[PDB]
Design an enzyme around this catalytic site. Structure first.
Site, PDB file in Angstrom:
ATOM      1  N   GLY A  11      10.374 -38.305 -22.946  1.00 28.03           N
ATOM      2  CA  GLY A  11       9.225 -37.455 -23.144  1.00 28.03           C
ATOM      3  C   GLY A  11       8.762 -36.873 -21.809  1.00 28.03           C
ATOM      4  O   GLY A  11       7.863 -36.033 -21.696  1.00 28.03           O
ATOM      5  N   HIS A  24      18.439 -29.415 -20.342  1.00 29.63           N
ATOM      6  CA  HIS A  24      18.613 -30.190 -21.547  1.00 29.63           C
ATOM      7  C   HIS A  24      17.412 -30.083 -22.478  1.00 29.63           C
ATOM      8  O   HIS A  24      17.492 -30.537 -23.625  1.00 29.63           O
ATOM      9  CB  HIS A  24      18.917 -31.666 -21.175  1.00 29.63           C
ATOM     10  CG  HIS A  24      17.779 -32.599 -20.798  1.00 29.63           C
ATOM     11  ND1 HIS A  24      17.421 -33.011 -19.585  1.00 29.63           N
ATOM     12  CD2 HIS A  24      16.950 -33.224 -21.724  1.00 29.63           C
ATOM     13  CE1 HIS A  24      16.404 -33.861 -19.754  1.00 29.63           C
ATOM     14  NE2 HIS A  24      16.143 -33.974 -21.033  1.00 29.63           N
ATOM     15  N   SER A  64      11.047 -35.583 -19.672  1.00 27.45           N
ATOM     16  CA  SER A  64      12.064 -34.635 -19.240  1.00 27.45           C
ATOM     17  C   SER A  64      11.549 -33.206 -19.030  1.00 27.45           C
ATOM     18  O   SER A  64      10.698 -32.685 -19.758  1.00 27.45           O
ATOM     19  CB  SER A  64      13.211 -34.610 -20.232  1.00 27.45           C
ATOM     20  OG  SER A  64      14.034 -35.764 -20.388  1.00 27.45           O
ATOM     21  N   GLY A  65      12.007 -32.652 -17.906  1.00 27.08           N
ATOM     22  CA  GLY A  65      11.680 -31.310 -17.465  1.00 27.08           C
ATOM     23  C   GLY A  65      10.472 -31.238 -16.552  1.00 27.08           C
ATOM     24  O   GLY A  65      10.250 -30.216 -15.912  1.00 27.08           O
ATOM     25  N   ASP A 117      21.001 -29.541 -14.088  1.00 24.64           N
ATOM     26  CA  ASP A 117      20.066 -29.632 -15.200  1.00 24.64           C
ATOM     27  C   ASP A 117      18.725 -28.970 -14.836  1.00 24.64           C
ATOM     28  O   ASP A 117      17.732 -29.626 -14.525  1.00 24.64           O
ATOM     29  CB  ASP A 117      19.920 -31.138 -15.553  1.00 24.64           C
ATOM     30  CG  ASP A 117      19.118 -31.470 -16.805  1.00 24.64           C
ATOM     31  OD1 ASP A 117      18.825 -30.571 -17.579  1.00 24.64           O
ATOM     32  OD2 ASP A 117      18.790 -32.639 -17.030  1.00 24.64           O
TER      33      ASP A 117
HETATM   34  B1  0ZX Z   1      14.059 -36.779 -21.544  1.00 25.91           B
HETATM   35  O1  0ZX Z   1      12.645 -36.708 -22.034  1.00 25.91           O
HETATM   36  C1  0ZX Z   1      12.094 -36.018 -23.191  1.00 25.91           C
HETATM   37  C2  0ZX Z   1      12.366 -34.554 -23.458  1.00 25.91           C
HETATM   38  O2  0ZX Z   1      14.973 -36.074 -22.461  1.00 25.91           O
HETATM   39  C3  0ZX Z   1      15.491 -36.214 -23.797  1.00 25.91           C
HETATM   40  C4  0ZX Z   1      15.240 -37.532 -24.545  1.00 25.91           C
HETATM   41  C5  0ZX Z   1      14.608 -38.198 -20.931  1.00 25.91           C
HETATM   42  C6  0ZX Z   1      13.995 -38.540 -19.587  1.00 25.91           C
HETATM   43  C7  0ZX Z   1      14.454 -39.922 -19.179  1.00 25.91           C
HETATM   44  C8  0ZX Z   1      13.956 -40.246 -17.806  1.00 25.91           C
HETATM   45  C9  0ZX Z   1      14.407 -41.652 -17.539  1.00 25.91           C
HETATM   46  N1  0ZX Z   1      14.080 -42.044 -16.191  1.00 25.91           N
HETATM   47  N2  0ZX Z   1      16.020 -37.874 -20.721  1.00 25.91           N
HETATM   48  C10 0ZX Z   1      17.027 -38.429 -21.417  1.00 25.91           C
HETATM   49  O3  0ZX Z   1      16.821 -39.232 -22.350  1.00 25.91           O
HETATM   50  C11 0ZX Z   1      18.482 -38.116 -21.017  1.00 25.91           C
HETATM   51  N3  0ZX Z   1      19.287 -39.240 -21.420  1.00 25.91           N
HETATM   52  C12 0ZX Z   1      19.402 -40.319 -20.658  1.00 25.91           C
HETATM   53  O4  0ZX Z   1      18.819 -40.435 -19.560  1.00 25.91           O
HETATM   54  C13 0ZX Z   1      20.257 -41.406 -21.306  1.00 25.91           C
HETATM   55  C14 0ZX Z   1      19.318 -42.267 -22.132  1.00 25.91           C
HETATM   56  N4  0ZX Z   1      20.972 -42.203 -20.327  1.00 25.91           N
HETATM   57  C15 0ZX Z   1      22.096 -42.879 -20.555  1.00 25.91           C
HETATM   58  O5  0ZX Z   1      22.641 -42.898 -21.661  1.00 25.91           O
HETATM   59  O6  0ZX Z   1      22.632 -43.602 -19.506  1.00 25.91           O
HETATM   60  C16 0ZX Z   1      23.965 -43.664 -18.989  1.00 25.91           C
HETATM   61  C17 0ZX Z   1      24.737 -44.818 -19.668  1.00 25.91           C
HETATM   62  C18 0ZX Z   1      23.897 -43.902 -17.467  1.00 25.91           C
HETATM   63  C19 0ZX Z   1      24.739 -42.340 -19.168  1.00 25.91           C
HETATM   64  C20 0ZX Z   1      19.268 -36.949 -21.694  1.00 25.91           C
HETATM   65  C21 0ZX Z   1      18.857 -36.595 -23.089  1.00 25.91           C
HETATM   66  C22 0ZX Z   1      19.167 -35.826 -20.723  1.00 25.91           C
END
Ligand code: 0ZX
Length: 223
Positions: free
Chosen positions: A175, A40, A177-178, A84
């Site tokens: 922030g 992602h 993520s990855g 992912d």
């Molecule tokens: B991540 O970090 C920055 C690049 O990616 C994009 C914003 C972030 C890491 C979150 C870790 C949390 N412990 N990932 C995301 O935001 C991902 N989205 C979600 O986790 C969303 C907010 N979750 C959500 O909507 O919850 C449900 C209702 C259960 C589906 C996504 C962009 C991969």
């Protein structure tokens, strides 16, 4: 990272920042020419930044190398976030020293109860926003697949694991993520997603790296 601590400069030496004009994602260095991150996190024009602590100041240990190819997992589903994971090949090999080093890939999957280190430059508040400039660290256990599944009903695949605190307070966040989840010195997870950050009964969900070990070795061998 919510409720973590300042890691210290270059104490997490496989941590990379992925940059396209600003930090947008973390990753882990797995040999001198490849990074693993979350699928992602994909975008065109990634510059990989190694040897980082403060991502807003050149402090002398940095290696900024452009990405030559990115390979998102063949079965990545963005609607479920199943599989992912992505690989990024660097345009030139990084120089590995004590402050820039690779993290070992696992040969076994980690058990529940294992403690892990999750690191990154993401949001430090559960409600509201403050993005650190220096790398933050969090020590957290892997939760049992029953606790994970009861927390996210009908959403955890066999390629996902939960790590954190059911009580909340500490978690990865936007922030991070990855970035790496390293348990016992082996890379076991990738910061993937969760319901917000640090909410009660909603721990972070992580891509289960041990399930991808052959795809990673195969892809590196042929590219
Ligand atoms: B991540 O970090 C920055 C690049 O990616 C994009 C914003 C972030 C890491 C979150 C870790 C949390 N412990 N990932 C995301 O935001 C991902 N989205 C979600 O986790 C969303 C907010 N979750 C959500 O909507 O919850 C449900 C209702 C259960 C589906 C996504 C962009 C991969």
């Amino acid at each position: 990272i919510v409720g973590g601590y300042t890691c210290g400069a270059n104490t997490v030496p496989y941590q990379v920042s992925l940059n396209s004009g600003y930090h947008f994602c973390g990753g882990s260095l797995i040999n001198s020419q490849w990074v693993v991150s979350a699928a992602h996190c994909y975008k065109s024009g990634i510059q990989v930044r190694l040897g980082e602590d403060n991502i807003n100041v050149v402090e002398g240990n940095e290696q900024f190398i452009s990405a030559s190819k990115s390979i998102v997992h063949p079965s990545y589903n963005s609607n479920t976030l199943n599989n992912d994971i992505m690989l990024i090949k660097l345009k030139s090999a990084a120089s590995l020293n004590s402050r820039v080093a690779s993290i070992s890939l696992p040969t076994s999957c980690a058990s529940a109860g294992t403690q892990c280190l999750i690191s990154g430059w993401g949001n430090t508040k559960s409600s509201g926003t403050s993005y650190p400039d220096v790398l933050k660290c969090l020590k957290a256990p892997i939760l049992s697949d029953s606790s994970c599944k009861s927390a996210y009903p009908g959403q955890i695949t066999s390629n996902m694991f939960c790590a954190g605190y059911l009580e909340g307070g500490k978690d990865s966040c936007q922030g991070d993520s990855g970035g790496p989840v390293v348990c016992s010195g082996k890379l076991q997870g990738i910061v993937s997603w969760g319901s917000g950050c640090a909410q009660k009964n909603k721990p972070g969900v992580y891509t289960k790296v041990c399930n991808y070990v052959s795809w990673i070795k195969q892809t590196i061998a042929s590219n």
